[PDB]
Design a protein around this ligand. Structure first.
Ligand SMILES: O=C(Cc1ccccc1)Nc1nnc(NC2CCN(c3nnc(NC(=O)Cc4ccccc4)s3)CC2)s1
Ligand SMILES: O=C(Cc1ccccc1)Nc1nnc(NC2CCN(c3nnc(NC(=O)Cc4ccccc4)s3)CC2)s1
Lengths: 410, 410
């Protein structure tokens, strides 16, 4: 027998030759994009075959063989419905409906304490999905770049835990939500920031990464790390946002001096320099599409789903997901954990980085924020998604009443 | 041929007739107990054929069929390794090692604020497992009755959500942990108890159940409900503990009067009567074995795994598991959520009701408590369990480093 051949007969349909466009259409309907880095050899060989034989363009078993050989495992799982969401076309139809429903939620106020966000139209709204198998779907404004802002907090904590371990990192930062009106306290009773998802905690975490090297190399080190998490999709930087943030960051400077006085930083920390680095990390730019791949890396236990590359330790990812679950949505964190039950992180630019463990990552972006600082449409979408699908952390995978389970078929 | 026959040859081993003891021994190693209520018809039929003789006695394919045919689906999944933990004998060996490691953790203090807790030996230590498929294992003192105490709090919250819905229940009680020192406050800022897992929340939740009927019928209703949750294994009542709890429940009376003055109860509540009902609920008795079945009902989306009966709505179970995750272990709740990542609830008698969603429920019981009120051995066991197995809520089911996954053949 042969894997290329019985996959050939799978698409062949009794016919002798597969039209090339018919193979591409079947591939796309699994959810994989033709640009997937794991399919490069196959797509290069297909394009090359369309050049060397315009006497075509139809693939016989042996020419189909030589195109798919290099990527045959991934291609087989895709075509034998082995991906985490088998009927991806049906699922994206649901995502689109959820998207259109949240589109009609027009309230909230765009953040405006800096010029680079008041800039953003209230009506931008994008949602991108990347499953742990690399299946992609986007709807709305998913290639508009925006700053991560606090969405970067779980990512830089994960880097810190990856490089230094749980025990070291959490000598400096706690692991719990603060409680609905210890919002305002910079430190818990052990003189540590409450958790990595608040500014004081994120500032301390920022000071743990790549200690001893200067800010230029620290930033490059973090960027290279975000590139891998995003499978090398768009990660950028907004210098306009950085300059405005550092120029308007009086409270973060208040936090910085308070943490210095309380000796919250590692020995030899230049606190003002860490604040600069912090403002830079908040100014890193993504799109919905690229950020959804970062989320999918966290959903996939530290492996980037569109490259296969191990990016973060399971410990770093587990810790990060734990704290996103309980600390990720500002004062809405307890409500979100109860009703949505998914690890998520929101930012002032309107992003919500969302993780369904073992299923998928998402980025929802809509600049208008509610009074707790969370994107109105993102919050609405997240509630709807879990109303529809049994993705709540404490939904049961066997007894889920009327919810839909996109992991199953019939 | 047919399913009874095709399973007959599996156990037959080429032999022409199966000894009865060889079938029982094979069944037990799947993890099922012969007393499983779903196997009653089969065991009754075995009982009848064991009476027609005093020989072997040995089953030919046709009489085996006559015994097993009523329970053939369940018997097939058990014998063709379809249960959630396929190699259960290997898994119980690990449970045994975890048990023996926690046994040497000899610290902590037995609760003594009333005599009924104060008499329990410091050295009692039991762990019971019930998977979502009804596979059972116990090690240590697992048939000694002890009071649920605060372990009853998630069960009566589940009942209330089951009967009345999330929205009504949470008019009276919040959905969040209070934070590591708004510990002492009875109400959050919306004049509701912070969540159902604290005394103030449980007291209010108690006032929502079976309203309008008197306390005796209320207690009967809750007992019946716990019977279904435990698949009719042991549930009792300690009047001694009840009497002691009510005479030394000064703080609970302080809470009750405070909630009354703040109008936290439904109209027509007799607050002093509700406190009495509350003390009774804390005095309900279980064993490790019966309580692990209750936990397994929560692990199984509201279906009792050893009877098949729907006991709780999926919404009640999801809500209960969410609040156990974040509020279940007193001031250790945040540490426990971060490190163990399992919904759990502890009580002052030393019980820890533990749920691994979609896998199993457990009850750990060891009377000596740490400084936060949690059983020392239970806390140690829970950490060890998640160190060993990829059961952390934010462990990945595909990439889990060196952890063991008992869900996998491979
Ligand atoms: O001490 C501890 C450890 C601890 C914790 C818990 C229990 C015991 C011990 N942590 C600390 N972290 N940060 C501290 N100083 C900060 C200075 C800036 N902030 C603020 N300064 N001033 C305000 N004022 C209103 O916030 C005003 C207000 C009044 C009423 C209602 C709402 C708001 S916050 C927050 C306090 S101290
Ligand atoms: O008000 C709110 C809502 C709220 C929440 C957040 C922000 C604004 C509004 N909830 C309330 N719940 N219960 C209240 N009265 C209770 C009477 C019994 N308890 C206690 N009484 N007295 C103590 N005394 C020390 O606990 C001693 C101590 C003091 C400071 C530090 C450590 C220890 S507790 C708790 C207070 S009020």
């Amino acid at each position: 027998p042969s894997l290329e051949d019985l996959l050939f007969y799978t698409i062949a349909e009794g016919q002798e030759k597969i039209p090339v466009h018919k193979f591409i259409t079947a591939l796309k309907s699994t959810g994989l994009r033709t640009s997937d880095p794991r399919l490069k050899e196959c797509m290069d060989m297909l394009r090359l075959t369309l050049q060397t034989t315009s006497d075509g363009v139809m693939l016989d078993k042996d020419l189909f063989k030589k195109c798919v050989q290099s990527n045959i495992v991934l291609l087989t799982q895709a075509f034998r419905r082995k991906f985490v969401i088998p009927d991806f076309m049906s699922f994206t139809s649901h995502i689109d409906e959820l998207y259109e429903s949240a589109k009609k939620q027009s309230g909230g106020k765009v953040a405006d304490y800096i010029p680079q966000l008041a800039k953003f139209s209230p009506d931008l709204w994008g949602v991108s999905v990347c499953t742990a198998d690399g299946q992609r779907h986007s709807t709305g404004d998913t290639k508009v770049p925006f700053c991560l802002q606090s969405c970067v907090k779980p990512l830089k904590y994960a880097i810190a835990v990856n490089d230094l371990g749980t025990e070291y990192v959490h000598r400096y930062v706690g692991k719990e939500p603060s409680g609905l009106r210890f919002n305002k306290l910079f430190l818990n009773e052990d003189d540590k920031p409450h958790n990595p998802m608040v500014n004081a905690g994120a500032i301390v975490v920022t000071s743990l990464i790549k200690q001893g090297v200067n800010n230029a190399e620290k930033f490059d080190y973090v960027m290279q790390f975000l590139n891998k998490m995003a499978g090398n999709e768009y990660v950028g930087f907004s210098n306009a946002t950085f300059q405005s943030e550092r120029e308007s960051g009086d409270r973060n400077f208040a936090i910085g001096y308070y943490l210095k006085e309380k000796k919250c930083f590692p020995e030899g920390t230049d606190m003002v320099g860490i604040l600069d680095f912090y403002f830079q990390l908040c100014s890193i730019e993504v799109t919905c599409e690229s950020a959804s791949v970062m989320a999918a890396t966290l959903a996939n236990g530290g492996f980037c789903p569109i490259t296969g590359e191990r990016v973060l330790s399971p410990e770093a990812v587990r810790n990060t997901l734990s704290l996103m679950h309980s600390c990720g949505m500002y004062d809405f964190s307890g409500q979100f954990a109860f009703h949505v039950g998914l690890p998520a992180k929101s930012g002032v630019a309107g992003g919500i980085l969302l993780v369904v463990p073992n299923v998928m990552g998402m980025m929802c972006w809509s600049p208008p924020l509610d009074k707790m600082g969370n994107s109105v449409k993102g919050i609405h979408f997240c509630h709807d998604l879990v109303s529809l699908c049994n993705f709540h952390n404490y939904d049961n995978l066997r007894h889920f009443a009327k919810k839909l389970d996109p992991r199953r078929e019939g």
